[PDB]
Subunit: 273 residues, 5 copies
């Protein structure tokens, strides 16, 4: 069957199909995904006034990100269930092309909201020392955009052209490393002149940021992480990818947002944790 | 017809089918489910300022849980009606696999929000005495997650492998008992140093918590509670399961949330009740 | 064909079909239904601060009821259009079972929100004299639930078993009379020690309550109110039922809520109308 | 084909079909419709505190009307696209009865919200002199309802029975004239003893009211305004009808609401325009 | 296949079909579109109180525009996926007419909100010097409407009648140039008597306005910008058009709104940036 430049889910779906567990789990984890985001939207709105005025833009940007992530994860949940249909005879879910091919690209372009806003929002909580606000913001946003767009092109080829997949991935990675570099700088300057309590939180934020963001290129590579005809080039790999996205999404957006809120409280003149 | 690792609803649906009453009731009770949750969302938002600032996080977390539960119960309501279709010739609803198999697993993974947040939220109303806040929270969250994940694996096998069903269920149960243990401690420490009115409420909360949470493993076992080829391995058991979920959901989320709100009022310096 | 324990709409739909007017009107009146409820939701939220704090729970409970009623009436609007499909050859809408049978039972189980909350909410406006708050509430809620549950069982049989229909209906009626009894008591005690203006409103509330609530058993019986093979056992009776529900819904929920709000204003120490 | 008592859209749709332009425009204009209403909902909520408390009920009722109109226009937009399907062979959209016949009656019954509330809401801005508040309200509401109900019956016959169409239309018209009469009285009494600024606005409101409300019987007659086999008994007439509704809807609801808000500001003791 | 007065997307879709990348990208970019708008809605509401009262109408009108754009872009996202269906045999998406033809006309009529409101809203932030507020508003609104309506007629013919396409486009362009003229005047008068910081922002607003608004006629012409049978009369041109719309939409609505908000802050007597 002729699929072209399509994600590997569609190939598994079209040949082997998915077991009840594989299909249902993938559905469940996406559903949990979008549920978490809408719950988070409510949380961040409802807690705006828990911090001093100057910090409240962080709450607002969290909320912005929640909207994006909800809409996407919801749309993608539906895309999953439309793309694969139960076959009675064998008792597995197979590619139903009338529902469109499944594509992870939805996530990527929506990152053009999430990434810039997540990177931006810390700059409303921490004070920089030697770095300039506008400079950091511009570096974040440029490298963010390039990271995403290059990756986005990559993933179309994850089956059809493994070379293009890896080369685009590599280029993307370069921009990723730049972001890591700049964020580390920000975190360090953030720590300067604040309580030990706030410094502990920023330490935690950095570890959360580093792990959670790294999951995303993890999900990129997922089908191939056990090499050719490996364990992960299978319904098991499909499950793994969406699990990793969901963990990454919750970590990088919600928990990140919560920790920033907690930092904002410690830095607030009225309030205490 | 090969169904595999699927819930028992699909087996009843595929062999006997469901009567008008069985199909419609199941539909109605899920609808009532999600209606209750959205109504609850409104209630908890609209009553935030009925309690002192420090208590208001309980209202917010109630609201968070309402969002999760609404989304899930709504999604599951639709799943029910898509999965079973009327057959004119016999006048019963039968498995329609084009709608996907029905699976209760949606609930389980969404509990990864509900359970942690419900356990968490009491710690914003009551003061601990001998226990440490972070300790209780960590025990709740770890045991919560393990309870859910093990159960989630179990339920896939409730027909296909009765042994796996029961063993996973048993392991889950161990974690459940731990939670019960910790919550009892919390309730007792909560009672110390507060009005008799607030103590009465916490007494009620404990009974509500104990019954409502125990319904959930009840629903797990439901098809087998009258043994093999029992009364409950039938459309009657299908109805019963979703009824029990809905009672449990309303009790454990809404009423629980309401009682905590009432406790918060009694502990509030301004307010009376 | 074999329909079983199904509402009479499905029997009309399956034999005679519905005319354009009958089908469209039923659709229109349900649509108006849910529109009214969402508009009411807005009204009750937006007018919360028009009354003293102590009265504001009445506004909140109105809002709660609006959410329930919206969701249900919306869902039921869609159920109507899915259940009956145009036949080109004869030019009438006939039962389309692929859409599920139509069932009024959706309403009934959602009353488990509406009824308790509507009865409850007056107790936040009026002061009782000789009666106890918790006593009245418990009687309302118990008799409410029994009324609904017994009726709910009844209506499944409105075609399939006329005896069961009437017996369950009769039992339901007993609990209805109890509620009427208790509400009358409440209204009388409410009138004691308040302005003539507030007393006039409570007089109006009682008449509204009595008529509007009585429409509901009216809708129950509707197909049979002109006896066997009567005028109303027809598409005309189908129309009539849903019209009566919608009148009853608007009266018993919205207008009731509005009048209570007006009462709350007169009893409010700052406020004037 | 046998269509029965159906709107003329369905007859054009069933015989000639609709061109790309006719089908798409009708779709676009309904979409614009419901978009305007939801935008208006936001506007009216967000501007509540721009006027003195006593005037704020006008904002609230505007908002109520917006909800109704949104829901309806949205529902009707979907009805349009479901009712007419592209035929490849000829390249026109034809009646698809599996989607139900299109009916304008949805609008009419929703007017049972819109009309009463629009007429009501002015009575919260202007002061009457010689007329009684409750008297005007009752006349508005009675004549409103009769206007709508009679018209609603009429439009079912606009093809099937031209006599009934015109007679019901005529009766409706009588009630319309009564409303015009009463509104003129209200406007004049409104003008008495208020600033020149407020008087100018009421002058504008009257012209807006008169034109916008008259469009609605215009849309009623639309197919026949060029007589038999005229220009307008065609896809061109279908387009025209929905355009006129949309102009009327925006004028009679949104702009009307805006002008009243502006009047409320001029009459407000705190505020300036 | 007879398509008639239809957009060129449908012709590409009906002959060549779309590759995975072309179909998916178009879907992704529209999704990002509507996501951005809903996020923007939240932002503009949540930041109303960040500026002095007099400026807050700009926030409200931003919000209004967000609602319109969300609804449209959402609706259009769905229209895309309904209009083109995967063909298994060749592995390309082809026109599926059961989903309706795709038409960009949805956008145009919704501009009847967006354009007037965007032009209007600046007049609440800047002070005019030479010009009259009502005069500028009327010129904006008249020329806006004429621009849109003429363009709207044009685009129906972009394939079927290239002459009509270009003539209507030309007429539209005339009105566009008028708007540019008036806006330039506004921006210059805005700069007079305000801080250098606010002047820099208005400089930026002008460049943003000029580029972003010019993209829209760009998208109009897109298929023909490489002449006959050029690179862009292809799936590549389809992609390009929707990319350009989305860039234009984000720029002209969100970023424009953000910059105005920033200007409002600098002009605010309480607040600083
Ligand atoms: C700029 C980066 C472009 C990379 C293109 C690419 O990797 O192409 C691989 C080649 O087609 C393998 O056969
Ligand atoms: C089936 C069961 C129906 C569930 C009932 C309501 C669901 C909506 C939640 C609304 C909860 C209202 C509770 C309430 O009114 O309590 C007031 C409180 O005692 C003073 O603060
Ligand atoms: C704390 C972490 C739990 C770790 C392992 C649990 C292992 C439980 C797995 C039980 C599987 C039982 C089974 O597979 O049944 C054997 C046979 O098929 C029946 O007939
Ligand atoms: C980490 C998730 C581990 C998933 C573990 C899945 C175990 C499933 C199981 O217990 O096996 C039952 C089956 O019937 C025997 O073949
Ligand atoms: C309520 C659920 C508990 C068990 C349900 C009670 C048994 C079903 C009630 C019933 O009406 O039985 C007839 C059959 O289920 C249909 O025709
Ligand atoms: C739980 C309540 C169980 C309710 C049991 C349902 C009773 C069914 C009934 O009343 O119907 C009798 C007759 O068999 C109909 O044809
Ligand atoms: C408890 C009341 C239960 C009432 C149930 C009535 C059952 C009944 O009337 O059965 C009729 C019989 O099946 C022949 O018509
Ligand atoms: C005043 C309110 C209602 C008027 C009641 C009178 C209703 C008269 C309706 C006339 C009618 O229905 O017309 C019959 C038709 O012309 C046959 O060809
Ligand atoms: C409510 C009364 C319904 C009025 C409908 C009567 C009517 O006007 O029908 C036209 C004609 O007489 C029938 O073919
Ligand atoms: C193409 C893809 C790009 C899509 C990205 C747009 C994100 C969408 C909505 C967020 C709302 C905008 C939030 C911008 C914040 C700017 C800001 O806050 O700066 C001024 C501040 O308020 C000083 O007090
Ligand atoms: C002013 C309205 C005038 C605009 C009408 C233009 C129509 C047109 O350009 O027609 C071309 C001709 O039909 C090609 O064969
Ligand atoms: C190919 C394009 C890729 C698209 C993705 C690129 C990232 C852009 C993200 C958001 C822009 C939102 C617009 C906000 C513009 C104003 C920012 C600003 O004013 O700066 C903050 C201010 O200094 C503090 O007060
Ligand atoms: C909320 C969403 C977030 C934080 C997304 C982050 C995405 C990345 C860090 C993506 C990184 C990638 C690489 C570094 C290589 C492969 C391509 C990407 C874009 C997945
Ligand atoms: C709002 C949802 C709640 C409170 C869910 C609670 C779920 C449980 C207490 C589940 C318990 C289970 C067992 C103890 C055994 C079987 C597996 C579970 C997960 C159903
Ligand atoms: C908002 C919904 C309300 C107020 C519903 C009220 C329902 C009733 C009063 C139902 C009464 C019934 C009887 C007394 C006999 C037949 C069975 C019932 C439940 C319809
Ligand atoms: C927001 C909706 C409004 C203001 C609707 C107004 C409707 C009318 C004024 C209808 C008038 C009619 C006639 C006077 C004759 C034909 C039947 C009607 C109902 C369309
Ligand atoms: C938010 C939407 C906006 C700002 C839309 C702006 C639209 C235009 C500036 C359209 C311009 C056109 C021309 C000048 C020629 C072709 C026809 C139009 C309407 C696309
Ligand atoms: C399915 C029935 C389960 C009900 C359990 C009742 C809870 C008892 C614990 C106290
Ligand atoms: C049988 C249905 C049970 C209805 C429950 C209402 C009982 C009242 C208990 C309220 C205690 C606060
Ligand atoms: C439809 C008009 C109302 C009919 C009255 C029948 C009500 C019976 C109530 C029994 C209690
Ligand atoms: C045909 C398009 C009509 C545009 C209406 C958009 C809906 C929102 C209404 C906002 C009205 C703005 C007027 C503000 C001026 C008051 C001072
Ligand atoms: C306290 C407020 C009092 C409101 C009284 C206003 C009454 C308006 C209700 C309208 C009822 C119209 C009844 C029409 C009957 C159907 C006849 C249609 C002709 C065939
Ligand atoms: C100053 C005006 C510059 C605006 C640029 C507009 C270009 C639009 C053409 C579309 C982009 C090319 C795509 C092939
Ligand atoms: C950095 C990690 C990248 C590892 C690249 C390994 C490439 C795997 O090789 C690929 O495996 C597929 C699935 O088994 C096969 O279907 C393909 O034919 C094969 O090219
Ligand atoms: C604590 C409750 C667990 C008891 C397990 C009950 C054993 C059920 O046994 C099962 O019953 C099914 C339905 O009757 C049969 O179809 C299966 O063959 C049988 O394995
Ligand atoms: C108290 C109100 C209840 C009145 C009961 C009336 C009995 C109706 O009798 C029923 O009428 C149906 C409709 O034609 C027939 O199809 C049934 O066979 C018949 O039993
Ligand atoms: C303006 C209000 C009165 C208008 C009445 C016009 C009479 C229309 O007459 C009708 O025209 C239809 C369309 O051409 C024909 O198909 C019908 O046969 C004819 O009865
Ligand atoms: C200002 C830019 C306008 C240039 C318009 C000239 C291009 C018109 O060229 C058109 O190309 C189409 C596909 O490429 C063909 O199908 C048409 O037959 C042809 O007229
Ligand atoms: Na599926
Ligand atoms: Na079904
Ligand atoms: Na239908
Ligand atoms: Na269509
Ligand atoms: Na598609």
């Amino acid at each position: 069957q002729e699929l072209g430049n399509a994600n590997f889910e569609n190939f598994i779906g079209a040949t082997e199909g998915f077991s009840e567990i594989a299909y249902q789990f993938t559905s469940h984890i996406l559903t949990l995904g979008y549920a978490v985001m809408l719950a988070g939207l409510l949380y961040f709105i409802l807690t705006i006034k828990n911090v001093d005025k100057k910090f409240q833009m962080s709450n607002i940007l969290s909320a912005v990100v929640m909207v994006s992530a909800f809409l996407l994860l919801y749309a993608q949940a539906q895309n999953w269930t439309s793309s694969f249909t139960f076959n009675e005879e064998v008792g597995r879910y197979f590619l139903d092309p009338s529902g469109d091919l499944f594509n992870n690209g939805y996530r990527y372009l929506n990152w053009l909201i999430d990434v810039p806003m997540l990177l931006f929002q810390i700059l409303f909580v921490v004070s920089l020392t030697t770095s300039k606000f506008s400079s950091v913001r511009n570096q974040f946003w440029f490298s963010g955009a390039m990271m995403i767009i290059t990756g986005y092109i990559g993933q179309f080829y994850e089956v059809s052209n493994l070379t293009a997949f890896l080369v685009w991935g590599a280029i993307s990675s370069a921009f990723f490393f730049h972001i890591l570099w700049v964020m580390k700088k920000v975190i360090n300057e953030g720590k300067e002149g604040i309580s030990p309590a706030g410094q502990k939180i920023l330490s935690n934020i950095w570890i959360l940021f580093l792990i959670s963001w790294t999951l995303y290129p993890g999900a990129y590579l997922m089908p191939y992480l056990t090499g050719v005809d490996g364990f992960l080039y299978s319904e098991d790999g499909v499950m793994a990818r969406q699990l990793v996205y969901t963990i990454a999404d919750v970590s990088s957006k919600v928990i990140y947002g919560v920790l920033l809120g907690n930092l904002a409280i410690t830095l607030s003149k009225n309030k205490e944790l």
